[PDB]
Every structure is written in C-alpha cells, then in structure tokens.
Amino acid sequence: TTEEQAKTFLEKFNHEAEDLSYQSSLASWNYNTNITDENVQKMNEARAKWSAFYEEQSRMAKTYSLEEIQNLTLKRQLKALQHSGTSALSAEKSKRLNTILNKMSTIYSTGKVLDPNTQECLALEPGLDDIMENSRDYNRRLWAWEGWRAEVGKQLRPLYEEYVVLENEMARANNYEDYGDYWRGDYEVTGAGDYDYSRDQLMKDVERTFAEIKPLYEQLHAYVRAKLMHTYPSYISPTGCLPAHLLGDMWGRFWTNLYSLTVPFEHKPSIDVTEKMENQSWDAERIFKEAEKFFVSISLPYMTQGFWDNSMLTEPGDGRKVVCHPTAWDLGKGDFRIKMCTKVTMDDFLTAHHEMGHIQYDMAYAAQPYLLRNGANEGFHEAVGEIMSLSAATPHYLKALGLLAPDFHEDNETEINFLLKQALTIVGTLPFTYMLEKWRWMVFKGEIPKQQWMEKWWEMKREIVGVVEPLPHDETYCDPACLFHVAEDYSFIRYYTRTIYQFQFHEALCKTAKHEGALFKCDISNSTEAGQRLLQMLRLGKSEPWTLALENIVGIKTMDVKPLLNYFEPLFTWLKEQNRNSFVGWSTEWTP
Amino acid sequence: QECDFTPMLTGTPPPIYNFKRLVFTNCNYNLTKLLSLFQVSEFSCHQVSPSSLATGCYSSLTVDYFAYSTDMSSYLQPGSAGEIVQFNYKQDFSNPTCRVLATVPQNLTTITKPSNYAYLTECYKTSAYGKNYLYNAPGGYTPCLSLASRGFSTKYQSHSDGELTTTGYIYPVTGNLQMAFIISVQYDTNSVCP
Lengths: 592, 194
Ligand SMILES: *[C@@H]1O[C@H](CO[C@@H]2O[C@@H](C)[C@@H](O)[C@@H](O)[C@@H]2O)[C@@H](O[C@@H]2O[C@H](CO)[C@@H](O[C@@H]3O[C@H](CO)[C@@H](O)[C@H](O)[C@@H]3O)[C@H](O)[C@H]2NC(C)=O)[C@H](O)[C@H]1NC(C)=O
Ligand SMILES: *[C@@H]1O[C@H](CO[C@@H]2O[C@@H](C)[C@@H](O)[C@@H](O)[C@@H]2O)[C@@H](O[C@@H]2O[C@H](CO)[C@@H](O[C@@H]3O[C@H](CO)[C@@H](O)[C@H](O)[C@@H]3O)[C@H](O)[C@H]2NC(C)=O)[C@H](O)[C@H]1NC(C)=O
Ligand SMILES: *[C@@H]1O[C@H](CO)[C@@H](O[C@@H]2O[C@H](CO)[C@@H](O)[C@H](O)[C@H]2NC(C)=O)[C@H](O)[C@H]1NC(C)=O
Ligand SMILES: *[C@@H]1O[C@H](CO)[C@@H](O)[C@H](O)[C@H]1NC(C)=O
Ligand SMILES: *[C@@H]1O[C@H](CO)[C@@H](O)[C@H](O)[C@H]1NC(C)=O
Ligand SMILES: *[C@@H]1O[C@H](CO)[C@@H](O)[C@H](O)[C@H]1NC(C)=O
Ligand SMILES: [Zn+2]
Known about the structure:
Number of strands of chain A: 6
Family (chain B): Belongs to the betacoronaviruses spike protein family.
Helix content of chain A: 55-70%
Subunit structure (chain B): Homotrimer; each monomer consists of a S1 and a S2 subunit. The resulting peplomers protrude from the virus surface as spikes.
Bound molecules: a molecule of 4 linked components (NAG-NAG-BMA-FUC), a molecule of 2 linked components (NAG-NAG), 2-acetamido-2-deoxy-beta-D-glucopyranose, zinc ion
Shape of chain A: globular
Oligomer: heterodimer
Organism (chain B): Bat coronavirus HKU5
Protein name (chain B): Spike glycoprotein
Largest sheet of chain A: 2 strands, antiparallel
Shape of chain B: globular
Number of helices of chain B: 5
Radius of gyration of chain B: 18 Å
Subcellular location (chain B): Virion membrane; Host endoplasmic reticulum-Golgi intermediate compartment membrane; Host cell membrane
Distance between the termini of chain A: 70 Å
Number of domains of chain B: 2
C-alpha cells in the first residue's frame, strides 16, 4: 500500500543523501580550517547542491499521507521530510523575511557606540564586552549598558515588529497556533502511549521546575546583593532588586564575572593544575590522550586513527587562518574530527573532555538513518558534554593523573568556593533563560500587544529575576533584541532543559558507580556499569521518543530538578547560615 | 621437504581487507631464517610462546600476511574493537596464534612497495531503517571484498552495487614498508616439523 511505497522512497533517500551530506560537510571543514576565497566558493557550491537535493526530496515526500503509515520509524522520517517551514509562505513574503533577518544580523554585528571622551567607536566585541566584564566604575558601566541599548535596539524595534508578523504567518501556514508553538514542537511526542508529551506540557513542566528552583536562587541573590553593597555603597537598596548594569556582562545572562567580588574565602586559592602541566611538559596531544583514556576506562570505544591524523588539535603556524571556536564534527561515513586551538591549561583540559564526549555521542548512533542521527531532543547533546567536564574537574580524578600531590588535603572552604563559583554560572542563568523565553512565547502568542512590549519586559525582570533597570525605557526601545539569540532567531529554552538534564544524568550515573558521599565529589572513572548505562541511551539517537531515552538512563520519564538541588545542598546550607542577618527576597517598587 | 616462503617475499603485500593466506603441510619450517630477514618490532603469542612456536610438530601451518603500519598496532589487539577488527581482519583464537609486526629492510628488493596503506571503515546493507553492518567472522574475509576490489583514490570513498556499500580510507607509505604476519598452527601430526 502506501507504506511499501514510502519504504521504497526512504530507502532511495537514505542511499542518495550520504554522499551529498558528506561532501557539504567536508567543504565546510576545509573552509573553517583554511580560510581562502576558493574554499568559500567550494563550500557554497556544496551547500547549494545539498539544498537542491533536499528541496526536491521534500517535495516528493509531501505526497505520502502520514495517517496511513503504521511503522513509527518511517513515520518520523516522513514527518521530518514533510516540513515546509518558510517555503509555506509566498515568494514575496519569504524574500521579505530573509531580508529582515539579514538586516537584523548585520545591525547586531556592526553596531557601534561613540565614546564622547576619547572620540573612539566601540563595538560590542571586544569594546563594550571588556567594560561590562571587568569595570567596577558605576558610571562607565551605565554608559556602556545604556549606549548599547539606545544605539542598536532602537534600530531593531521596527524590524522585529515585522519579523513577528511574518513568523506567525509562517507558523500558521504549517498548522501551528503560533511561532512559539512551532518552536515547542521540538519536545512533542505522539502515538507512543504513556510516553506521549504535548507542547503545552513543556510550559507546565518549565513552570513547575522553576517554582522549585526559586528558594536556592533567592539565597544566592541575597548573598550577591550583600557582597555588592560593599563595592557600590549608596547605589544598592538592601531590600530591592539589583541594578541591571552591575551583573558582570552586557545582559546579566551569567553571574560568573562577579566571582572576584563574591568569593566566600579569598585567602584560600582554587585548584589549578596548569603550573603542574607546564612543569611536566604536557602538550595538546597528551591532553586528548588523557581524555581518550578516561572514556576507555568506562568501557567506551577508542578514537579512530582518522581522528588522530585529520583533527586540528593545535593552532597551525604555517600561515593558515582558522576559527578557534572548539567544535566536534561528524562528517559522515566514519569521519569524526575535532577543531580546537588547544593551550596547556586546565580549562583546555576540561574542554577536551567535553568535546570528546560530543564525539562519543556522535559515534554511538552512527547506525541510525540519516534523519534520526541526533540527540533525543535539543538538550541531550550538551548535557552529555557537560557531565564529562563535571567528572574531570574533581580532585580524585586529578590525583589519579598525578596532577595533584598524593597527600593533597581537601578543606571545606575550598569546596564552598568551588560550589559558589559553580552556582554563579549554573543557578544564576536559569531565571534569565526562563524569563526571556516566557516573554517571547507571550509575544508570539499575542498576550502582549506591541504597545506594552517594554512595559512587560521590565515588570517580569523585576518579579522573576530580581533585576531593575537603571533608566526607564519606553516603546521606542527593544531590549530583548539586543541579545544575540533573539536577533538571530534562535530558540532559548534549550539552555534551561539541558541544565535540568545534566544533573539528572550525573546523579543517575554516580549511583550506578556506587559513589559514597556528596554528589559534587563524584567521579565515574573506572566504572564500566555506568558506561554501559550511558551507552544504552546514547545508541538510540532520535529513533525513540525522548521520554523513553530519559527513562532508559535515569529510570523516570519526566524532568526533575531535585538532583540539581542535591548537587548544591552544602552551598544551600552555608548560604542560609550566611544570610541570617540579611533580608531574603526583593521588592518590585524600589528603583535606582 | 623444505618449506617455501618465497611467494611471500616476492611482489607487493596486499591491503589488510585483502590479506594473503599461505597454508603449509608436510614441511620442514626454518622459522628463524624467515624472521631474520625483517626488523621485528612486535611478537605476541596466544596459547604458545615465541620459543615454543619455533619448536614442535604441527599438522598445518597457516600464515596470513598484509601491509600494516606499526603505529596502528593498538587496533589489532585481542579484545580490541573498532573498524579494523569489524570490517578488515578478525584474529581467530581457537588455536595457538602469534602476531608479528615487522619492518622491511632496504636490503629486500623483491618486496615492492604499495602506493598507500588502506583499510575499510564500514561495510553494510542499506535500508529504510538504518545501516545493517556486516562483520567479519574469525579468520574470514569481508563480504564487501568484491566492492573494495574496485580501488580507492581518496579518503572516505564509497562503492555501492545497490544492496551493499563499502567505504575506504588510504594514506601514503613513507619510509620502509611495514608488514603484519599472523601465524596459526593446527594439530597426521608430524607433517610440519622443525
Ligand atoms: C583506574 O584504575 C587504574 C587501574 O587500577 C588497577 O586495577 C584495578 C582493578 C585495581 O586493582 C587498582 O588497585 C589497580 O591499580 C588506576 O591506575 C593505577 O593506579 C594505581 C594507583 O594506586 C597505580 O599503582 C601505582 O603504580 C606504580 C607503578 O606504575 C607504583 O610506583 C606505585 O607504588 C603504585 O602501585 C597503578 O600502577 C595504576 N595502573 C595503571 C595500569 O596505570 C587508575 O588510577 C584508576 N583511575 C582513577 C581515576 O581512579
Ligand atoms: C568546615 O568544617 C569545620 C569543622 O566542622 C567539622 O568538620 C566538618 C567536615 C563536619 O563534619 C562538621 O560537623 C564538623 O564539626 C566547620 O567549623 C565548625 O562549624 C560548626 C558550625 O557548623 C561549629 O559549631 C559551633 O560551635 C560552637 C562552640 O565552639 C557553638 O557556639 C555553636 O553553636 C556551634 O555548635 C564548630 O565549632 C566549628 N568547628 C571548629 C573546629 O571551629 C566550618 O564551619 C566548616 N566551614 C565551611 C565553610 O563549611
Ligand atoms: C589552503 O587553501 C589553499 C588555497 O585555497 C590551498 O592551496 C591550493 O593547494 C592545491 C593543492 O591541491 C593547489 O593545487 C592549488 O593551486 C592551491 N591554491 C592556491 C590558491 O594556492 C592550500 O593547499 C590549503 N592548505 C591546506 C593545508 O590544505
Ligand atoms: C518497524 O519495522 C522495523 C523493521 O521492519 C521493526 O524493527 C520495528 O519494530 C517496526 N516498528 C513499528 C512501530 O512497527
Ligand atoms: C633456521 O634458520 C637459521 C637462520 O637464521 C639457521 O641458523 C638455523 O640453523 C635454521 N634451523 C635449522 C636448519 O634447523
Ligand atoms: C643487509 O642487512 C644487514 C643486517 O644488518 C646489514 O648488515 C647489511 O649491510 C645489509 N645490506 C646492505 C647491502 O647494506
Ligand atoms: Zn559543546
């Protein structure tokens, strides 16, 4: 019937897609490690060929009816192939949407603010970022924070208004309620019984987990406010929100750069093995050999010989221009590579472990059909990458490698410093991510008319994040669009769920490893049972619903935030003891 | 009945997925003379010893040889996995065996050098439900051998006949040629004696 013809069609598609995808990936790799005009031309040609093939195959796939297909693997492949996207719009509307997207990207990339004192124009990178990351001058930070939003966001406001309308039209053309519902379609599971998951369930689950996250974040917020009152007397209310321009970066997405102002025990130095690595004459190859040994110790496979002779592990010195962003590449047909400009530092050590975890995930699901070769959903890959870095940083793993002395002493003040630094990065970014995505969902849905976009932006900031703007902004501003992911049309909730997944995976493996003690001291090295448990989920790829894969690794099919609170419990106790003579919480009435 | 190892010393050694197999019976093997012609770098035996291999009688003596870089010796180990064992060569441990990795000295001129070292990275049947990988049996050949006989001129190159797909990897030969020998003994019982 229809299923047999669809099976024939999918066999043909799978046979023909391999070579084209591989050639496009190889051209992209050759451009990225060797920047020349001819390489750009070759990369563009390969991408054009792949795009033409994929468009023709999607057009052919749309003729088959999903309701007639019984097998779920074929149904998933056909549903992936039958999505039109912007092609559901008319040609004029699609051209207008592309023009708007390119204009917003260019405005973000080339925006500049003119410093009155020195007659110098600063771009966001590196000019304004250096001020927000390192300045302790209230006025200089205020100048940068206000100038970026006045110079760039006011240009993006009308473009973003047009972009919202066009994307809603696109989403309704593909049988979605709106563009946010379209984005939330990533987590949707249908026709699987107890494993089904709707698009509204995602919003319900996010709200439920954030309500549980709130008390720890309030303790952290009070501690940070009390610390910052020493650096900025007369600028910070003891019972109010934090001013938005004193949070360590341009948006307050991370609180990391505040560590030097908030370290609980300044006299105790952190663990850093860089000097020990320099004393023993390490190089990048040895770092990656150690990462490979770590993965072998938990019964994962070795790297391939092609991985060793085709990767770019150090920055070349032969006159080639490269990009030094660490990436893991799955080109296809057994070709796995890593691009990284490795230095001899502890951070590069952790990054090597993280990227080799990406490679291991890519290798596990290599037998799946092409359209199903990815993580279970958009948050799985990065969580898998993060747990390896969690294991690699513990003193146990470093003492086993000889990077610490055998008689190394672990005092609890060093541990509290480490936990506070982890919290500044992990706990502090969750309310930001949640608030941003909630605002975008309400804008796409239409619950916020454009006459109140900014009004609802700062009302939510004060009430969910405890952050207050230093200057009031009317509807000529577009503050959310001054962030990269908003201006480049990227969904943001992946950064939330990934966090929830991370500590769910870690705690599940540490129990399989029979770890005794606190969760933040867990190292899963030399535990083959934990490796097998991880491989059970990794081999699935995207051929099963993500709830089934989650139940495979952790034993339940739902997102839970209790493992995260279990990771930070000693810090939670210390914080509640430190804030005993401080106000916990904020008011939404005080303003700078 | 002197044993003749001459065909192994003549010609070009093949790639690993197309390894050469020589069976000897009713022979008198001068193993030391054979091994003295190469600069031996690795000699690992299973169920036997290197000294015990060069002594005693066997019913049959099998030698599987191919061109193989010694720097890949880790992928040719008992219990090791990966593409080499899966798609190119699986060592059969149902009998005493010995794996020898050696280097060809510039003295020997009858052994001509291949252009590249080569191996297969995958061998599978295609379908709508993914790849059905085909694995080597212990001591057997790959089912993608006929496809791989076409040849490979670039890294990660595929040959398909419609129901079978194979992908190959090549890299140039630099310096002296390196080879791998797999020696197996099966054991009337005094056909092959020292
Ligand atoms: C993962 O496990 C390896 C191997 O562990 C070894 O086998 C296990 C089944 C247990 O029986 C272990 O006790 C056993 O060591 C660990 O590597 C090993 O570390 C130990 C540290 O005690 C090393 O012992 C030292 O060896 C040197 C000689 O090289 C002597 O100078 C020392 O006095 C001391 O005995 C041992 O050599 C080493 N083994 C190998 C093969 O490297 C590894 O540390 C562990 N990883 C983690 C993160 O815990
Ligand atoms: C680091 O740890 C020390 C030592 O605490 C001891 O070791 C820990 C690993 C745990 O097992 C503890 O149970 C164990 O005692 C901590 O110092 C200790 O703090 C406690 C408070 O939690 C102090 O108890 C107080 O003692 C006085 C009497 O002197 C009473 O007035 C108080 O009501 C209260 O009972 C304890 O005295 C103190 N110990 C010492 C030797 O000073 C330390 O707080 C901890 N630091 C961090 C940052 O976690
Ligand atoms: C980096 O790119 C340049 C040019 O894009 C490469 O130079 C080419 O090398 C090929 C060798 O196959 C020559 O035939 C071409 O004539 C060269 N082109 C130019 C413009 O010089 C160069 O080889 C690349 N580098 C690496 C390491 O691959
Ligand atoms: C789909 O078919 C494959 C192979 O025929 C089988 O393994 C799988 O269980 C089937 N799935 C469903 C949902 O019918
Ligand atoms: C085996 O060959 C070696 C050459 O190295 C020779 O010395 C030895 O006598 C031979 N063994 C015999 C003839 O039994
Ligand atoms: C042959 O190899 C032997 C073994 O070392 C060496 O002595 C001899 O010089 C080589 N032959 C030539 C012609 O160099
Ligand atoms: Zn990553």
